[PDB]
Point group: D2
Chain length 337, copies 4
């Protein structure tokens, strides 16, 4: 007997989630969708031969008693609104990054979930389900390299559109690093600082590219993260953790090697979409499985969404301040441990 899922926002990524749930995962179906372009959400129901109702807005869909759970996968700032409603309507919500665009927005959502007794909210930080990052986690949990002291990491992308703005680099992009990193090391951010290198010839005039972002935790781990979204060569995620007694490092995506015209090579991806395909699948399936076999959700929490929001804010602050901004977090409610 399969979980009945309603999708809010049938854009490019909500279309990807509809396809995995329909044709790749196990034990769930899409019974309802609503988009803001109601005509698009009516061409998607046909496209994937869904057996689903098409609502004009969220409220209508959240009223429907079929739907046990919703995917929030619409425009970014329209998230907070739909999550609060779904919590009050007491449905399970899988909400794509970001949880909300402001730090208080995330706080409002925590307070609601806190009331409604159990965990309803999983945030779509898929990196925690990628086998690379899972292995790093395992080695750290095993004290393979003793105490983490520094982290170097990088998030690069071939080119961006006319729409990509200086803040998006730390809000839409460095956001997964921010989530995954503190999950691995089990610590909280303290300060953030932003440093701009010589600007790239591949960056448009309004964009500042690359950027380095230093970040210290409370324990004193020092992270420096490079964000270069016009690197031209490929899409590439690198993460090295230096510990007291050794170093561990994230793998490249699997690739056949080639020997030809003087070079020994492997392939680098050009498409951010392709990089985490497996972790999307495993993440959703875990929302599904965790609900039917526990009565609550298991992944990244509303709280983790809140931590991403505060730090993301401090970054955008140190971004035009040029100074060493501070990251101030409220006490972690007993609810979340």
């Amino acid at each position: 007997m399969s979980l009945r899922i309603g999708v809010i926002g049938t854009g490019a990524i909500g279309k990807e989630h509809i396809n995995r749930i329909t044709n790749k995962l196990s034990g769930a179906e899409i019974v309802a969708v609503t988009d803001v372009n109601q005509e698009a959400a009516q061409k998607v129901v046909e496209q994937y031969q869904l057996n689903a109702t098409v609502y004009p807005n969220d409220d209508s869909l959240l009223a429907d008693e079929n739907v046990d759970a919703v995917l929030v996968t619409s425009w970014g700032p329209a998230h907070e609104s739909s999550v609060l409603k779904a919590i009050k309507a007491q449905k399970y919500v899988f909400c794509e990054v970001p949880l909300a665009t402001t730090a208080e927005g995330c706080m409002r959502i925590v307070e609601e979930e806190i009331k409604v007794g159990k965990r309803l909210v999983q945030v779509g930080f898929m990196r925690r389900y990628d086998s690379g990052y899972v292995q790093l986690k395992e080695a750290l949990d095993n004290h393979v390299i003793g105490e983490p002291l520094m982290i170097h990491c990088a998030h690069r992308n071939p080119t961006v559109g006319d729409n990509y703005t200086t803040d998006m680099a730390v809000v839409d992009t460095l956001v997964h690093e921010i989530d995954v990193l503190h999950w691995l090391v089990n610590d909280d951010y303290e300060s953030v600082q932003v440093i701009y290198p010589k600007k790239s010839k591949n960056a448009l005039p309004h964009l500042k590219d690359p950027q380095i972002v230093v970040i210290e935790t409370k324990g004193g781990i020092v992270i420096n993260a490079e964000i270069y979204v016009n690197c031209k060569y490929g899409y590439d995620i690198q993460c090295e953790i230096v510990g007291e007694d050794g170093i561990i490092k994230l793998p490249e995506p699997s690739s056949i090697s080639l020997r030809k015209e003087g070079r020994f090579s492997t392939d680098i991806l050009m498409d951010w979409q392709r990089r985490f395909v497996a972790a999307y699948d495993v993440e959703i399936q875990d929302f599904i499985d965790s609900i039917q076999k526990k009565g609550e959700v298991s992944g990244p929490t509303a709280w983790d969404g809140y931590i991403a929001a505060v730090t993301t804010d401090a970054c955008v602050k140190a971004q035009e301040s040029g100074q060493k901004e501070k990251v101030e977090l409220k006490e972690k409610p007993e609810f979340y441990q």
Copy 2:
């Protein structure tokens, strides 16, 4: 509306397939099982909370009109029998390696499928679905390295039981290499030769370990394959294809690197089961998807099973002959292209 699958042989591997279909894949269910230890097949229905009928034998299960398709995943020599029945009962059959234990056994099965008009039989040669081997295929199809001339490859395993016999090395083990290799290069085997190196201290007395197996295709590709099932260090599959203008090579499984006590390392698997987990999933899902969206099966064919059987036989021949045995194949029926 999901495909109704009956499993013949609820052993260790048929249990793995029941679990992927039940809890990982999409659009199919297990409605029927039969084992030879009928008590075991009645503890498996409970184990995975299946909603399935338990038959005493294949015939009973193949009569059941629920079941559209069957997994043949029982003892090895009990395959041919169950496949012929399922073809005549006109159900879709996914049959695990081997198709049958004798070369004529595979021929009998081809003749039956040939009659019944369309493709019912997929053979479980999962390597063709592994992303490594898929990439090699893609580069060869693109003429990246021109004409294949030689292949070097290796199939190693830490240790084997008291049950592992000299012939099993080319019958149960080198069998996937044999299937996958000719699929990649699109050619047929001509001769096989077997050469025994100094015998390993890790091999039991009745077993001959390692072995090298040279194999020539009709076009003149020269393959040498190493089979060392007591290599102790790990489970490891290596495949290098040398072409006219360059070389392509299979990847290692993804692993975090580590720097500690004087060494820079990655992990090697110890468990053959873990190596191809993803290709099992993708293989089954493709049996499922290909049936509901085409009315026939798509994978490795009954014919490919026949090619594996002939070559596997010539190998066991050159295995105790010590001579350069021959591989003689019947004409490839128009049915299969």
Copy 3:
């Protein structure tokens, strides 16, 4: 007819240079030595069966008309003194790092060389002769990756003695990085900043280990350099240069790979001495060759020594300031380009 070399300071490293010149290189001999422990200098002349005069002090040795060139390889702060003397005595001087321990000390030496018409002083920054760094140089000179924007690099060492102090990390250690990096990118340092991560359990109480050192050039290249001298795992130099259109990276030292007990590994060196052995050889041979076939020295210059001194000072400043210190350099005299 071979170059006659006098060695000032017959310690451990001056002994290594006497051995290479005597038994490995071409076209030079040691005809004179002086140490501060004059007894040790005699034991050296005997040890390497030298045919050399033993002076009580530098002045005596610089008077000797045999010696065309001197190695300054004595205790650190005793360098400046011996280099000024050798310049005025008008001999060729190869001076090991540092050129002098203060920034003005290097300035005094530049002024002397400036007068004496030609280049007499090569500083022993051997990295410029290592084949790795030579290749990076070549790729940058060829615009392979366009404009350098950032550099990440690391200098790690297993453990240090009771004698290793917090400033030595940027004075004795990060000093080669400081020389080589601006040689590669052809730019000058502007600011330096020092950040202390959580302190290591492998570091003694008086030592601050690791450190991160951020450094910006005038053009805007942003360098972050990690110095971890108690990393325990090995001796390891890493340098990655991120450019506009691609990334280039320093190689590991050559090593046989090994597959054993679950791991695929290569070796990491435990001894800083072993890492640059080939660049020492090539460096000295180039002092020799460049003198006999040009009448002047070719390597890193007295000026480059001065640049290392100013930046080294700013680092030690930002080291206890905790602030973003500045690097102020005098105009580059026409003499040096």
Copy 4:
């Protein structure tokens, strides 16, 4: 007091040896040369400003009492002649591969050295001095992987001239593999077999390219060696040794990695000359050093030359026989152990 060396054969490779001895190594000089084109030998003496006598033939040069040692570096079949003379004239001889072009030719040379009491003859098999091969040796000597069982290896070259003939592949090319491999594993060859794969489009019509060469030792190690001299992509030497409990593998030559246009790459050499440059240097220096500090030569022996000759012959035999030829070696004289 430096070793006085006479060079027989001032061709391209004898010119390289004259240059290293003159301008790179320590403790030796060229005091005498003779070529067959006596005019070329004069132009060489001038080219490298040598202080040397120019003889019309070997006999004259071997009479000269200056010369303690000779390099035999002339045209291939002219080696045996000059080595026998030098042994009887009782000079030290460094003889480039091959020692002689026939197996009995090597036998005549062994018998002469055997009489003259000590070791005069070093054969120029430089691989034993390359740091890669030295490391493999060390790991095998340490039983790191237990008992060697198989070896896979390859010798590839971009393209060859109109002058390169099918036999040269096993006589001029596979000859270093043949020497180095039995040195590593400390065993003797027993059989050889030659297998021709589909012929390459890069090979001329008179040449058979690639070839595989299987070789068994007495102990039962099974070696398969690939020789592809028109592989087009680069010059590339690969050697993998599979032992009982693990695998060891030769390194690639050091290279900077690059990330650009979709690929992560390293460089492959195009010039056989560049691959072993360091082992040539270390090899010669060891002829020199071993003579002045022992009164005999240390490297590969006249005997090792003989072993290469017998096996080289068996290969050329199995090369047009198509059969499994045999390698028959005379008893190893007590003189050589």
